[model samples]
Target: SHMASRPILIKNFAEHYRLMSADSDFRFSEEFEELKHVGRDQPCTFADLPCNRPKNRFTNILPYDHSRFKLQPVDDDEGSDYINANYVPGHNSPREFIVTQGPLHSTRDDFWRMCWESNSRAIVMLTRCFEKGREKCDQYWPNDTVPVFYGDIKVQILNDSHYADWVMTEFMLCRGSEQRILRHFHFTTWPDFGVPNPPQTLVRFVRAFRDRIGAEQRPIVVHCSAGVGRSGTFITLDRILQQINTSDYVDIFGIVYAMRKERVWMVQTEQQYICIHQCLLAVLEGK
Candidate 1:
């Protein structure tokens, strides 16, 4: 009986460790020392700015809401990276941007109308109804701007009252050249979160997508609910990794802080930052 208790004890300890390490309360400073620089003299170049600042949140206030989400317009301060400029907060390749609201009676029909109306060459959607929309996305486009689906949010809907459902993929379609739309191959740690924000995943996904589109010639669209927290974390981590590889210094917190101005509380939790540090450390070790 005492030995039986030992296994249970060990299990509890292990679970506790995981909870301390991975839970939202986890502090990143223990892993990646707190970055203390308030601001750096490093000038803001065109490359530094990759995310866009949406003009407004609601669609009715803005007619082109379907075509461009809040993340569509480029920030006034431009960066040096052509990828950032071209991507336009992931919707970089198109002239007009759009967004649709509510549970659509027909997701495909609504998307087709947006695509046709905007003259988008490609459509990017975040929906679980992959089978239903795939064909229609193909039908509407003559060539290039084919519709593509992103993975649904990792969390499952258990009850009627849960914010988790909002995390699910609604729809994000880019109406532009097909090549401009980029797909990221990410590794998921837990069932949800799609891809863990580890550095290895970041580096691999970036390199793979870069090669997939053949350098800076193509643009890729990325989204998550509100298209800020997960989206900003994903992009910011990618930028940090690039700096590490290039041996350039980066102000990670500063970037996050700036994003918070537009999308307050953008990163969601502190543990997410620790994950970024873990990923960065792995890359630094050349693993």
Candidate 2:
């Protein structure tokens, strides 16, 4: 068969996950190859513009114009609406999540503009400020009570709760007298270009996100270094977990393929694709 990724029912997913992930077949590689061009055909006109180029963290990773997150541009700032982000679907909603790159030092303010304009209440940050002596992401919030003004909005950290592998920080957003609380979930275990040491940590992280997201219609924002590798993997795993209860067959390819239609390089690597399967299997078998 041409397809390396097979659709497996939840009842027999445990056994099939092992079989498909085995090195004997290299199914993940085959599946990844098929996904290489899933989202590359879309137009990236906005990202390619000279005004928006500096805002992009990586030149190659661009959002599709059709489904990309359009911002309300600020006056006098050329192309102030540009941000390396996209409106991606979850298991159910067509645009339930905003997957974006880590805020650049120059674009951190633009990040807040998007957040403010979109009215996103929850943000999931998957990378740390620094990784292995390299600056992977710029610190967007303050470590103390000193608020940082991002254009018109003011941000202050109210509380930061540390978990074994992640941290949850609560921020107070101020715009005039109107104030709002923003919940930021920071998953520190995962790294850029790779998965976490163990898959259970990611499963637990997604579970925590879902538990917090209980009955919410607003778009949940998620970002990693490049916004597609770890970010896409997490979103895919989250979608699969939601689908397991109602779906007759678990279609890993379908989910990633759908996401790529909105944003490029989703479920970025073979290892990332395999990690999603590993997590699902662990959950079905009781992680």
Candidate 3:
């Protein structure tokens, strides 16, 4: 009976999601499309500045001022500026995340600086450094024994272990006499505008990364080429997992809607949105 109930439960759960997926409002696809237009009406004052333009993945997807996380200026003479990242709060939870685009060659130092200033313990990178013959992310870490300096901070890889689907590299970041450990988990399989096939691998990757970070309250930095797509998918999964213990049902619409409020273009495509439902179903089915 126990085994029988499990399959029945999964089938019912699948049906629930299937119906929810069919509704435009519940899926939030059209709503997401509408939000993109809102960005056009807003002034792109800071985003259009000559220095900051090249650093952005998309010209219109600039981080809003109030919730944007600014890196500490390297010097008093340097004016305050914004990175293409925003601070997104988890649903009904205090856990926060910094979701941003992959670093540009010019902003690599600022990227590391943001991590140091935010006291971020983990960096969940979903896109490869290079994809489709173009650079998706800047090579921010040290390549070999030599430490890479980003402004006043220095970063060195202390250890690296590669898995079949992902790679985990441990790093030590130093600023003057003080130092801290930062773990970088890179899921190398996901392509731009797509979700990982056999989502179980990504599920396992998220689990392992969470175990490594433990209960630390500091924000986890997540990025892909454009930041909102794959980044949103990962955060959505994490939030759903966080809710399983407290609720009998998952609120996929509410969760993604909250994320979109904080960061634009979250769960970018309808396919990605449906992918979230599929991933959750896989979890319930014990995949």
Candidate 4:
């Protein structure tokens, strides 16, 4: 189960060639185990399920509240009264903010028009909910939101349930045309079929986003399929990390609640919630 490091592999091969000409130690297997666990860590309480939230019979809630997180729904097809979308008001808000769900019904043209009109600094494209090769998504996504000076990654999600992988801030906030390239992070449910250890990935992305704007003034757009679960989790964790406090956890929830007044669910899985909670705990402990 030993994971063969690429550099180690090359070095070993060179040594093998010098020591014996008949040595063969090249084999790739999924069962191969790494000496150290790489990737996000999580809790044991989370379970797996689709993005299913209880329906509210009250009036439809607006997804983008300038005061805070708002719940924006696209259509009635998705069950929940609304889809995910948002607009941050304060100039000093964290660069890492959530864009609640709204990909299924949202047309590319609609998104493009909105971005064009808003003159947004950055747009976090969320395609985690859709299946791969979605004609509409591929065509409309990655709208021309790239600031004249910034680069953006276009993620085309293929996984059935999960979204894209994580990208560090240095790459995400770069200043060049290369930023417009399509960056796809295949977010798939782990063995439990639920999003686990999302904070690790989200934190990495947020850091990249924050670094991109050093002292400049611009907001980042973080989105997902619905923009509520994973999106919210990403933004919430980003805020917690920036502050590095345990008491501030409620502030994250409050921020999300203020924005998406109608919706209520950060990380979909109980385990995901626990994972984020635990990550916050770690940050606090370190602080």
Candidate number with greatest TM-score: 2
Over 4 Å off, model 3:
1-12, 21-44, 74-79, 91-95
lDDT of 4 at 20: 28
lDDT of 1 by residue, 42-73 (tens): 33232223331221222212112122322222
Superior candidate under TM-score, 2 versus 3: 2
lDDT of 2 by residue, 1-287 (tens): 22434567789887777677678547667666788887687799999999999989998899899988888867997777788999998976888899999998898888887887788898999898888888889998787888989878899999999998899989898888989888999998775546785799999999998888775588888998899988998888888888887887788887888888889888888888888988888898887
TM value for model 3: 0.86
lDDT of 4 by residue, 40-90 (tens): 132111111123222111123224223233233447644222223454322
The whole-model C-alpha lDDT of candidate 1 against the native structure comes to 0.34
Of 1 and 2, the candidate ahead on TM-score is 2
RMSD (Å) of each candidate, 1 decimal: 15.4, 2.0, 5.8, 16.3
Clashes of each: 31, 0, 0, 33
Predict model 4's lDDT versus the native. 0.37
Best by lDDT: 2
**TM-score-better candidate, 2 vs 4:** 2
Better of 2 and 4 by lDDT: 2
Q: Can you rank all candidates by TM-score, best first?
A: 2, 3, 4, 1
- In candidate 2, stretches whose alpha carbon ends up further than 4 angstroms from where it belongs are 1-6, 191-193
